[PDB]
Structure formats: C-alpha cells, structure tokens
Design a protein around this ligand. Structure first.
Ligand SMILES: COc1ccc(Nc2nc(Nc3c(C)cc(/C=C/C#N)cc3C)nc3nc[nH]c23)cc1
Lengths: 412, 554
C-alpha cells in the first residue's frame, strides 16, 4: 500500500515521445480498455501541465482474440534510474536454459495492485489519439505500476517473492525467472506434469489475489545451434572451389588455423566456372584439417553482462532466416535458423517480426536481457508494419542495415 | 443569483532552477500612462487584474501602442521573459485535421467564446509572476502595480490551458450528443451536424444552456461566417473541400526566395491538384542560402512550371469522407524519382491527391521507390482515415513476386492490384544464381595508386581473351567497377564474371536501375542488354587463378 519513491537519472527529464498513428480499431480497443482502467483507478486523466508522453498501441497476444494495451516505455526505461533493489540484480539463473521445458506466463496484471510514487506518475503520461486529430487526444497517467515499465518488476519483486514461497519450497528443482510482465517457469517434468505444475502455480496466484491463463511453452534443451559446415562432394567445379575458399577465408576470421593455400592452388590458370577440378591429396587433407577445426568451439568466447548483446538476422528466402547473437565480432554466443510458417507465407515483415520476437525470447532465457537487433529492412517499411504483427509485452531495440552483407550465404 | 460551477484551475510551475521575471519597466509618455491607467482600471473592474502591494519583486514591461492612428490606445504586456521561464505544456494543437478525413455536415454553426476565456482563472500561486508596473505621471508617485487573475494573452500557457479547460467542459455534451461535432479554433466554437436545421438549432441552444452552468455566454446573433470557411489554408464547403486559391506569379526574374515560395505553393496545391511536379524547380535551391540571389531557370524547370500552370488553371475540389464506402489509393510514376497519387472512394472523385519524391541516395530502383510511396501513403491514410487504403499499382503481380522473393531485404506491400497505365514499374535485369554452362568466364580486376591516381582495369578469360586499360584520375573502387564494365562490353549475351571487389558487389546486390555514378549507369545499361549474367565473388590476394591483380599491380 506504500509507494517506493522513484527518480529519473541525473540531468534527465521525462520522455516526450511522439504518439504514432493508430488504426480506428486499435483506437476503439484502447478507449474501451482505458475507460475501464480509469474506473478501476489504475490510470487518471491529466491536464496540459503534463508535457510528457510515451507511445501506446494495442496488440493481440499469441492465440487470443482480446486486445491488450501495450505501452512503449523504451525511452522511460532508459531514463529511469538504475533500479538497484534488494535483489541488486538477481544473478541471471543459468539453469533456466537447461530445463527440458519452459512455460511463459503473463503476470503483468499483478503490477496494478501496487500504487506508483505520486511524483513519478507524470512521467507515465500517454495519449489515446483521435483519427485525423478531430478530437483532443485522451491524456492519462498511471496511478499504479504500469506493464512494460522496467521499474515495475523491480518494485513488485518483494511482493512476488513471497507469493511464490509455498510453491517454490514445495518444488525446489523448478526454476522461476521474471522478466518484465513475464514469468519464466522451467522444469524437467513430463508435459502433462509440467502443465499441471504451471496450473498448480496459476490458481496459486488467483489464490494470492492474482491473461495469466495463457501459456507459452519453450524447449531450451532442444534449441537451435549452428556449427560451420563445408560441402561434401565427389565432383568440385571451379565455382564450387571458389565459393569454398571464400567461406573458409571468412571462417578464418573466427577460427585461427584455417588454411586455403592447397585449395587455391587448384585454381591456377583462368578456368571456366563450370569446369570440374579433381581434388589433390594436399587439397583434400587441407579441407579435412579445416573441417576438424570447425568442430572445436570458438576461442575466447565469454558473456559480459556490462555489454550489449547484438543480434543480426539474414533473410535466406523460402521463409528461412538465419541469426547470430554476439557482443564481439566473430565471437558468437548464439547462432540459429528459423523456417516457422506462422501465417506469414507471403509476408516478409511478419516473418521478420516473429523472428525478432523468438530471438528476444531466447535471449531473455539465456542471458536475462534483450539484444539490439540489426534488421535487414528499410526503416520506413519496418516502422510502418511491425506493430501489426507484435505479440510480446516487451519491445527490444533495433537498427537497420541498408548494405547487403556478403556473409549471407555462408550462414546457409 | 444562479450558482455556477467554477472552472478548475491548472497548476502551473516555472521551469526548474528558474525564478520569475525581473524586467525593468520602460519610461513612458504622460499620454500613454493616462491611457494605460484607464485601460487597467477597466480590466481591474472586470476582475482580470488586481492591484498588488510592494512586496512582489517580479516585473514584466508594459507598453502602449496607438491603434491605427485613431484616438484610442491599446495595451501590450510583453511576457517574453516569463515565457522563457514558464514550463512546457501539452500543446493539443499539434496536427490539424485534414479536410479529406472530415464527414460532410448539413449545418455548421459558429459560436464566439472570446468571453468564456476570462472565466478561466490563472493558478493562484503563479499569479505573482505576472506582475507589471504602470509608471506614474512624472515619476513623483509609486507606479501602479498589478497582477493577473486570468490567462494573459501572450502568456505561454494561455492557449493550452484555455483549450483544455473548454474541452473538459464540453466533454459530457459531446459524449451525450454523438450526432454533432465540436471543434475549437481560437475564439470560435464550430458546431456541426447532419441534422434538420430545426433539430440542429435545438442542439445549439442546448449547448448554450450547458455552457451557462459555468457562467459562459455565447453572444447569440449571426456571425459573419457562413460556408465556405477559410481555415488553415483550406476552403471548407458543405459537401466539398479545396485549398485556398493558388496563384503563381508572373515573373521575368526569380530569386531563391521566389522559388521557395513557388515550391511551397506547389507543395500545398499538390494535396488536391493531381500531377503537380517540383523536382526541376526544387533542384535549383540545392546549396544556396542567399535569398536575394537571382537564379536562372533551366529550360527543364520552365517546362515543369508551365505544366503546373495548366494544372492550376482549373479549380479542383476534393470530396469528404464516407466510412461506408471503400478507400482506394492509386499511384503513377512521373519520372526523375517523382511519384504522384490519388486517394478516392468513387472513381473520378478524389478525397485528396499527393506526391512522393525519391530519397537522397547513390543508387536506387523504381520498385524501392514505389514501396516507399506505398509506405508513406499508408501512414498518411492511417492518420487521416484510421485505415490502409486498397492500392492500385503500375506494377505486375509477377514482377513484385520476383522482386520480394529474391531481394536480400524483407519488404512488404499491403493489399494491392495491378493497374495497367504506363509507364509500368519493372525489373530491368536479373542476375543468375548458378554459373552458366557454355558462357565465357571473365576474371576482372582494377587497381589505382593513391598518390598518382593512375589506375588499370581489365580482364582475362578462359578462352584467352584479355584486356588492360590504363586510367587517369581514378580510385581503386572506380577501377573495380570499370573492370566489370569492360567485361560486359566485350562479352556475348551470356557471361560469367569473377571479381574480388566487395564494393562492386555491395552495389549490384542492391539491384539498382539508376545511379549518380555514370559508371554504375553504364554497367546497368550493359546488364539490361544481356540475357544471362552470373556474378561471382572471391577473396583478393589468395592466389585464386584468373583473379589477376598482376596485370593491374603495374
Ligand atoms: C462547412 O464546413 C465543414 C466543416 C466541418 C465538417 N466536418 C467535420 N468537422 C469536424 N470539426 C471541425 C468543424 C466542426 C469545423 C471546422 C471549421 C473550422 C473553421 N474555420 C473544422 C473542423 C475540424 N469534425 C468532424 N468529424 C466528422 N466530420 C467532421 C464539414 C464541413
């Protein structure tokens, strides 16, 4: 019932972020949601003496029909003080990514039970815009911990920790991790046993006074990894050998003792691209040596929590996408590949938006934070469409790559 | 006495760190002082200002200005200093409605709310900062000290607080009368409906009855304001809208300023006048700043202007929005990176028109530009109607599919249909995915000397064909492109090209159909002429055969 005081960072003001255009149906959804939230006292109307703003929009979560209000607190989050708590940062649970099954719960509605520090409320200002600026935008600010705000799980933590005790001490091997409005619950049980334990956890929140019914299930133990592989052929063309050497030259930035000399020697003279070149013994051995090298992991690869995680994505065609997460160039912490047909057979941007969400989810499970994406798409195209396909309650950072990377097919 | 609800005051603060203004009052004439005293006495009688003691250390200079050589003075309190020190507000004026988004209104009434303004009290704790001083006759008495009780005209917070106070009052009236629209612009309230004029006039008297509850009267006469309304550069008619008259001046000589004014007028006209062009007129203001500098018009720019004059010859109107009907956007390519579009519901009845200009860039293609135009129109349409229109595009379905399935970037165009009106957007070449059997293989390379700028470009092929061309005033990148150009020039309709230039591949994989570089453009023209081109990349200096740095090393 008591508000913990919150401040912004030194010499930082609140966010003044433009509200972007919303479709009529999202505007209606928000009017209805915010109307009821105002009744429940979670939000209140504000006057023109509040010049702050944070963008808002509406989404539909994975496999439901009910609209969810999503606030883009990215600016407020990076402007809100480094929230040291009594957790000091719960050191990210390394065992979560080893669990046979992980279920994701939306527990954001719990936040609304805790009031927000009065002097900070102004900074949670948002606007429901009208179509064509025909009526004044409806302005609101939060009276309680808002969903999507970094300070919300931070503050609610002590409340959450004691709600969990009966369940946790009962189930000492189950790992539970909180990120934003999400709860990650991983065990090594049977799906029906696991699902029951999650239900033995949901009702167990409904009992503690608290779409928590929804369940997103992952299987970390069987997650996508990617070694570098070279072709195995009985007949090599000049072109095949040229492509192999290009790939090895690139891999030599990652792996030290990669050699291409003997393979290059097969390319001497000016030969037709389609001409078959029989491999010498020196060339085959060199290829074999390289192949063995590509089995050993990369040298000097460590995660540093003080650094940003970087995620690159390449479009490989046919609904296929490759990605790599790293902090240092040529020091990949994670690589993967997607082909998921999630209602986007004819929509590149929808596929990318989903790839982005899946990669962020993986990154939260493994390191406990979201990577910064480098997206193979024009900004204007991405900015126009991603909200139509977005189903998560968090939003990562992204930049745009406008020059086609050569390394695309080396990941396919 | 009929009790009236008080208008709730807005808590105003100074910017943090800042104190109120302390600006010295100007010496005035005895003539002005008498005038100012008389004015400030009337205002004080009205409750707008109050006399204050000597405790208040704040001051804002007051002025007296002769109204149009009459025998009447007007007052001016200069709040620039206080405005510098006053907090930012939520300005609600940001973004004006676009007329094409509006619905037609049978009846639209204008009410004056200039008087309601003074029923909006200024935050009590802030009033002290509004202090001003009328100097005394001959400075032989203390100046008269006043402060504001109402929103001062010219004060930073006045428009936003007035607007938001009016909105809060009107809110339950608007909510319970969903068959009318209410829009405030300055001292005017516009009330519109599609109601029978009797039923409409009822709502108006009802609105007056509602405003009375806060002691607000709305003169009740007949404003000199019947349709069309002149508003924000538009003409709002009952059943149509258009821009205010566009008049392009006759001139024998144009300066930088004249052209800016010209483009600005054309940009404004482009929202309803279809096909308006501004590239050749805009590409003259490129790097200048001297507004007086008389710029000569290119023959290309005088042709664009004459075309515009013909388009501006006829008045054109847009229709209002009908939510029951569909929303359709059609785009045409104009050339020189220019695109024009119309948005309509019924054929030959545009809601509005518009244009899109190619971005700043080294290389581009029509498909990318069309995509950008689509995105822009999509966003504008969502702003104006809250929905994406259906598109009619001068591009074949097969062409788009080929494009997006093979393009290295993710790209998307919302629901659309091919419209067969030339010039059609197409792909001008398509590189091979595999080496071509039977086709000659060209190994190309270029190199240049940083100091001398001397370079070489050339090729060696599997058939023993060879060329090295010596080049002056060049770079490594130019020689790499030149080498590829030569290979295309000297090969048959099918050719394999091997290069080590990551630079040249970065460009060509971007699939441009036009470039700033004339060298890239010649390469493009060659590709268009070929039947099949396979471009392969290899790392430099790895001893890959054919890859002949040696003919270029020298
Ligand atoms: C004859 O002029 C008009 C004016 C407005 C409309 N339609 C609509 N207007 C508004 N708000 C509004 C109003 C009532 C008047 C003006 C003119 C100001 C001046 N001068 C401007 C606006 C924006 N809201 C609407 N919503 C649906 N149709 C609408 C139709 C014809």
């Amino acid at each position: 019932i008591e508000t913990v005081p919150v401040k912004l960072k030194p010499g930082m003001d609140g966010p003044k972020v433009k509200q972007w255009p919303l479709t009529e149906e999202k505007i209606k959804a928000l009017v209805e949601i915010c109307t009821e939230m105002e009744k429940e006292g979670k939000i209140s109307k504000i006057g023109p003496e509040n010049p702050y703003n944070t963008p808002v929009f509406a989404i539909k979560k994975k496999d439901s029909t009910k609209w969810r209000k999503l606030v883009d607190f990215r600016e407020l989050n990076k402007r809100t003080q480094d929230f040291w708590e009594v957790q000091l940062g719960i050191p990210h649970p390394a065992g979560l990514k080893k669990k046979k099954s992980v279920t994701v719960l939306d527990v954001g509605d719990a936040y609304f039970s805790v009031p927000l520090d009065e002097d900070f409320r102004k900074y949670t200002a948002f606007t429901i815009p009208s179509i064509n600026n025909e009526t004044p935008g409806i302005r609101y600010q939060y009276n309680v911990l808002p969903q999507g705000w970094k300070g919300s799980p931070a503050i609610f933590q002590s409340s959450m920790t004691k709600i969990l005790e009966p369940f946790k001490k009962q189930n000492p091997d189950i790992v539970i991790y909180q990120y934003m409005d999400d709860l990650y619950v991983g065990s090594d049980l049977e799906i029906g046993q696991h699902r029951t334990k999650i239900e033995e956890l949901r009702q167990h929140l409904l009992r503690w006074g608290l779409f928590l019914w929804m369940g997103y299930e992952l299987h970390p133990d069987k997650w996508t990894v990617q070694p570098i592989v070279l072709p195995e052929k009985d007949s090599w063309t000049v072109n095949d050998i040229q492509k192999l050497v290009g790939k090895l030259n690139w891999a030599s930035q990652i792996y030290p003792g990669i050699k291409v000399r003997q393979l290059s020697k097969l390319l001497r003279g000016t030969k037709a691209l389609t001409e078959v070149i029989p491999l010498t013994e020196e060339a085959e051995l060199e290829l074999a040596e390289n192949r063995e090298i590509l089995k050993e992991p990369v040298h000097g690869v460590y995660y540093d929590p003080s650094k940003d995680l970087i995620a690159e994505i390449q479009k490989q065609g046919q609904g296929q996408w490759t990605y790599q997460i790293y902090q240092e160039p040529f020091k990949n912490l994670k690589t993967g590949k997607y082909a998921r047909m999630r209602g986007a057979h004819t929509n590149d941007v929808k596929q990318l938006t989903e790839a982005v969400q899946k990669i962020t989810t993986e990154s939260i499970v493994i390191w406990g934070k979201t990577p910064k994406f480098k997206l193979p798409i024009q900004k204007e195209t991405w900015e126009t469409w991603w909200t139509e396909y977005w189903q998560a309650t968090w939003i990562p950072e992204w930049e745009f790559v406008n020059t086609p990377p050569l390394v695309k097919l080396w990941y396919q | 006495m009929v009790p009236i609800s008080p208008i709730e005051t807005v808590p105003v603060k100074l910017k943090p760190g800042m104190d109120g203004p302390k600006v010295k009052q100007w010496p005035l004439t005895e003539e002005k002082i008498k005038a100012l005293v008389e004015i400030c006495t009337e205002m004080e009688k009205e409750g707008k200002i109050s006399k204050i003691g000597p405790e208040n250390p704040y001051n804002t200079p007051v002025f007296a200005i002769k109204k149009k050589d009459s025998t009447k003075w007007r007052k001016l309190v200069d709040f620039r200093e206080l405005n510098k020190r006053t907090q930012d507000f939520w300005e609600v004026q940001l973004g004006i409605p676009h007329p094409a988004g509006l619905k037609k209104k049978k009846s639209v009434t204008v009410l004056d709310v200039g008087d309601a303004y003074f029923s909006v009290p200024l935050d009590e704790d802030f009033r002290k900062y509004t202090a001003f001083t009328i100097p005394s006759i001959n400075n032989e008495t203390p100046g008269i000290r006043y402060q504001y009780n109402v929103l001062p005209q010219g004060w930073k917070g006045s428009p936003a607080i007035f607007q938001s106070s009016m909105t809060k009052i009107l809110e339950p009236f608007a909510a319970q009368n969903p068959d009318i629209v209410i829009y405030q612009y300055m001292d005017d309230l516009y009330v519109g409906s599609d109601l029978e004029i009797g039923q409409h006039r009822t709502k108006i008297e009802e609105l007056r009855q509602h405003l009375l509850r806060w002691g607000l009267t709305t003169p009740d006469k007949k404003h000199q304001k019947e349709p069309p309304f002149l508003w924000m550069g538009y003409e709002l008619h009952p059943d149509k809208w258009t821009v205010q008259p566009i008049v392009l001046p006759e001139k024998d000589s144009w300066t930088v300023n004249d052209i800016q004014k010209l483009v600005g007028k054309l940009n404004w006209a482009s929202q309803i006048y279809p096909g308006i062009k501004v590239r050749q007129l805009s590409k003259l203001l490129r790097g200048t700043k001297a507004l007086t500098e008389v710029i000569p018009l290119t023959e290309e720019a005088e042709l664009e202007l004459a075309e515009n004059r013909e388009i501006l010859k006829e008045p054109v109107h847009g229709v209002y929005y009908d939510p029951s009907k569909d929303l359709i956007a059609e785009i045409q390519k104009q050339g020189q990176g220019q695109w024009t579009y119309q948005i309509y519901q019924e054929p030959f009845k545009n809601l509005k028109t518009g244009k899109y200009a190619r971005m700043r860039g080294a290389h581009t293609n029509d498909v990318k530009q069309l995509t950008e135009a689509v995105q822009k129109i999509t966003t504008e349409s969502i702003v104006i109607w809250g929905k994406t229109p259906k598109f009619k595009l001068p591009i074949q379905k097969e062409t788009w599919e080929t494009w997006w399935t093979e393009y290295w970037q993710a790209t998307w165009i919302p629901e659309w249909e091919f419209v067969n009106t030339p010039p059609l957007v197409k792909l001008w070449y398509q590189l091979e995915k595999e080496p071509i059997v039977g086709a000659e293989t060209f190994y190309v390379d270029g190199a240049a000397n940083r100091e001398t700028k001397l370079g070489k470009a050339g090729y060696v092929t599997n058939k023993g064909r060879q060329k090295v061309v010596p080049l002056t005033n060049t770079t490594n990148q130019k020689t790499e492109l030149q080498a590829i150009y030569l290979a295309l020039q000297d090969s048959g309709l099918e050719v394999n090209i091997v290069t080590d230039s990551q630079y040249a591949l970065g460009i060509i994989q971007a699939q441009p159909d036009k470039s700033e570089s004339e060298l890239v453009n010649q390469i493009i023209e060659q590709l268009i002429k070929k039947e099949k081109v396979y471009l392969a990349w290899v790392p430099a200096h790895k001893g890959i055969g054919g890859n002949e740095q040696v003919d270029k090393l020298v």
